[PDB]
Amino acid sequence: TNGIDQLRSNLALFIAYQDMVKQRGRAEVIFSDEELSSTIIPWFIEAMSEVSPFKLRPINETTSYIGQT
Amino acid sequence: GFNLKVKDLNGSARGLTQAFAIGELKNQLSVGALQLPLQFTRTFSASMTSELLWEVGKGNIDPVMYARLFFQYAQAGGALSVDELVNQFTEYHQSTACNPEIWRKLTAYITGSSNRAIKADAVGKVPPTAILEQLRTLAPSEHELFHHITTDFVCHVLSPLGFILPDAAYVYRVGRTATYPNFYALVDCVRASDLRRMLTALSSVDSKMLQATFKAKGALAPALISQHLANAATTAFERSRGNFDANAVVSSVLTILGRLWSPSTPKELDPSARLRNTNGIDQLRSNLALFIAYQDMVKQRGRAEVIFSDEELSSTIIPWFIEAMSEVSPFKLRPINETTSYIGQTSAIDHMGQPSHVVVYEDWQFAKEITAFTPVKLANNSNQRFLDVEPGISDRMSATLAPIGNTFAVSAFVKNRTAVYEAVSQRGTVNSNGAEMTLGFPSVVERDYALDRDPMVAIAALRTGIVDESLEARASNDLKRSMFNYYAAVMHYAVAHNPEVVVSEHQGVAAEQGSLYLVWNVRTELRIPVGYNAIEGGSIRTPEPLEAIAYNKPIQPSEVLQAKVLDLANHTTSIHIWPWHEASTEFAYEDAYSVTIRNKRYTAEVKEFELLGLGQRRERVRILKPTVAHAIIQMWYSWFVEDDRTLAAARRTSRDDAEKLAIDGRRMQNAVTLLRKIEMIGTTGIGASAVHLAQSRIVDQMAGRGLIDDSSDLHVGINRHRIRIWAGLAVLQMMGLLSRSEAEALTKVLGDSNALGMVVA
Amino acid sequence: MLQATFKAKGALAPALISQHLANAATTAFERSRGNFDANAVVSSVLTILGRLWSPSTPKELDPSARLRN
C-alpha cells in the first residue's frame, strides 16, 4: 500500500524515530489497527505535504558535500 | 479427429468426464443435485491466432511488450514457468546496487570518467549491446533476454535529446499461444504483472529524470543523472520487493470464488455481502472456463485454504487485480454471446431419429503458403543469425498445396466422415447402446504438436483416462496442458451452446464438500435413451457436457478460421535474432521409391534435390513446418490408426459374420478413404514431377541390363495406382508436413486391402 | 459497441453486434443484481448518524474516530 514501501527507506526520519522514542518512551496508542484502517493513518505524512519547507529526497547524493583527507 | 460412445464415455475416455478432472477415479458417476443457478459472460479467454513479430531495440520500451516476450519464452519452454523466469530474473538483477559500476561504465561509454564533465554527447547509441556485452562480462547472462533488456534504460533514447541514432531496432516472433489457462498459467500471469509493476515505473522515472536533466548547458554534464540513471530504478527495483505472492493470491481469488460458488453457508464459506459487491467479481463470478481452472487446481493441490484474505477489509486488496485485467497475458477477457463459437453440427438419422454420429468438429483453413529461411549467421558467431526469406521450394510447393488447400478442407473431411452414415445393417437399426462421438480441435494439436511431442500419446492417455505418468517433467507439462486445454475447450464450448448451468458437489470423498462439478439441462431431445439419462423428466440433467453436446441441433461454424500466416521480409532486412530454432536447419530429405516387375528390384531412389527442376541442394535453407498443416492431417492420422487398431480389436472380439461384414466395410472404407485421397494427391504438379521423373529414372534402370531395356513393361493398370501413392509420399514426408512413422502406417494399411483404383482412373 | 461496430463495410453486417446490442446490457442488468438493500442502507446511515448524535458513549454507540472523518 504505497508510500511506506519507500518510506521504510528514509533514515534520518528514522533518527527522528529514535529521538522521540527517547523523549516520550513509546506510549503505543496504536490508533491504527493491523490493516483497515492501518491505511487512514498513513494516508499522509510531512514529505508528501508541501506544507513543510522540508522535502523528500531522491537517489544517490543524499546530502553530500564534504571532502576527505 | 476422434470419437467415443454416447452412452458410455468413461469406458471410452475418462478424460472428458467432469469426474476425471474431479479425480473421481473411474468409479461412481456424478449426479448429486441440489443446485445453484448461473449465468455467462461467456468467460475470459485468449486469442487463438496471433502470429506476429515485435520490434525491440528501437528504444521505445514498454513492459507490456516484454511481458509477452517472457510469457512466450516460457511457452517455448525455454526454462519452465514464467515465475521461474522472474525469480531468476530478480536473481539476475540482484546485480542491482552492488554494481554502481553499471552506471560508472556505461557512462564511461558516454565518455567517460565523467568527472571531466561537460555537454559531452556526440553520437554512438544503438549497440551498447556489444559494449554491454562487455557489461555481460560485467553481468553474465546465460539468458540472452535480460541482457537484451537492461540496455534499454541507458538507451531507450537516454539522454533522449541525443544520444542519437539508432537507425536499427531488433526482433522477435511471437506466435499464437495457449488457448486456455490454468493454475501455473495464471500465476505466470500475475507474476508477469509484477514485472509489469516493474518496468513501467522503470521507464517513468528516467522519463522524468530527463525532464530534470538537460538543465542546459545542453544535455548538461555527466557523472550525475547519468550516474543516477537507474539508481532510482533500483529503488524502483526495490519498489518491486513485494507485489504479492502469486500462488497465494491466485489461490485466494480462486477459493473465495469457490465459496461464492458452493452451497456451503457457514462462516468458512460465507462471501461477505460486505464485499460480494466491489467491482470485477460481479462479472468475474460469471467466468466459467476460469471456473474450470478452479476445479483443476482444486484437483491438484487440494484446497490448502491459506485465505490470505479476510472477510472484507481487506478481501479487497487480494482481488485488487487478476490476469484478464492484466494486459500482461496474451490471454484476454471476453464479452457477451459468441463465447468462442465456430463449430457447426449435423447428426445421423435413422428416421427415428436419434444421432449415431455426433459430427462435432473443426473449422480451419490451413496456410496457403510457407517460406524457407536461409540461416545466414554472421554476427556474434553464436545464436545471432539472419534468415533472409526468398522464394525457393516456397512458391511452387505452395501452389501445389493449393489443391490440398481444397481437398483437405475440414468441411469436406467431416462431410465424408458424416457419409460413414449408414452402418450395421439397415436402416433404421444402426442403433445399439452406444454411438460414435466424433470430435477434434484445431487448437490442441496446433499447439501441443508445435511443441514437437506427438499429441496422440496424450490423446490416448485421455482415452484411457489415467495418466501414463512416466513422462519427463517437460512432458509431464505438455501432458497436463494437453489435458486441461482439451477438457476446458470442450467445456466452455458446450457451455457456449447451453445457456444454463448449476453448481454440484460431490460428495463421495467430500473432501469437505468444496469439491464440485456442474450439471446442465435441455429439453428438445426426443424421447430416447441417451447417456445414463433417458432423457428423464423431459429434460437432460447431466453432469457430463458431452451429453448436452449430443442433443444439440445441427448448426454452422462462425469464425474466420484462417491461419493468418506470418510474413517478415521487412523485419528480415531488420533482423537481428531471437529464439527461432525449430524449423530446423536443412529444409528437406530424400525418400526412396521402389517397385518390382518381371521379378526384378529397381529402387527409384530420389532426392532432394529441389526436385522441382533447378539444382542444387539448394543449399542451404530451412522452412518452418506449419503447425496447422501437419496438425490437421495428424488428426486424420489419428483417425486412421484409430479405426485400424480398434476395429481390428473388433476383428478379434465379435467374430459374428455380420460383424465381420461391419469390420469389412469400415476398415475397407477408411481404406478407400486414404485410397481416393492419395489418389487425388497424385495429380498434383509436384506429384506429376515425381511421377514423370522417378519413372524416367527407373526407365533408365530398364536401360541398365540390356534385355530389360525392352521398352516399358510396368504400365498396365495396377502399377500406376501403385506408384500414385509415391506422389502422396513426397506430399507426405519433406513436403514439410508429415513426420514419417506414418507412410509406415500407410504402407501397412495399403497392404491391408485390395486397394486397386479402387476404380478411377 | 457502436465504436466497435461500423467496421465498414459501412455500418457493417447484422446478426451480430445488433444481435448483441444489449446482451452485455443484460449482463449490465446482471451487474445490477446487487446495489445494496435500500431500507437496510438507509436505516444504516440513519442510525449511525443517530449514534453520532446520541450522548450514549458505549460500543453500541461509539462512532469510530477511525471513520468519524
Swiss-Prot record, chain B:
Keywords: Capsid protein, Inner capsid protein, RNA-binding, T=2 icosahedral capsid protein, Transcription, Viral nucleoprotein, Virion. GO terms for molecular function: identical protein binding; RNA binding. GO terms for cellular component: T=2 icosahedral viral capsid; viral inner capsid; viral nucleocapsid. The keyword RNA-binding applies. It is found in: Virion. It comes from the Viruses. Its main location: virion. InterPro entries: P1. The keyword RNA-binding applies. Homodimer. Associates with the polymerase complex. P1 is the major inner capsid (core) protein of the polyhedral procapsid, which is responsible for genomic replication and transcription. Forms a dodecahedral shell from 60 asymmetric dimers. Binds to RNA and may be involved in genomic packaging. This is Major inner protein P1. It comes from Pseudomonas phage phi6.
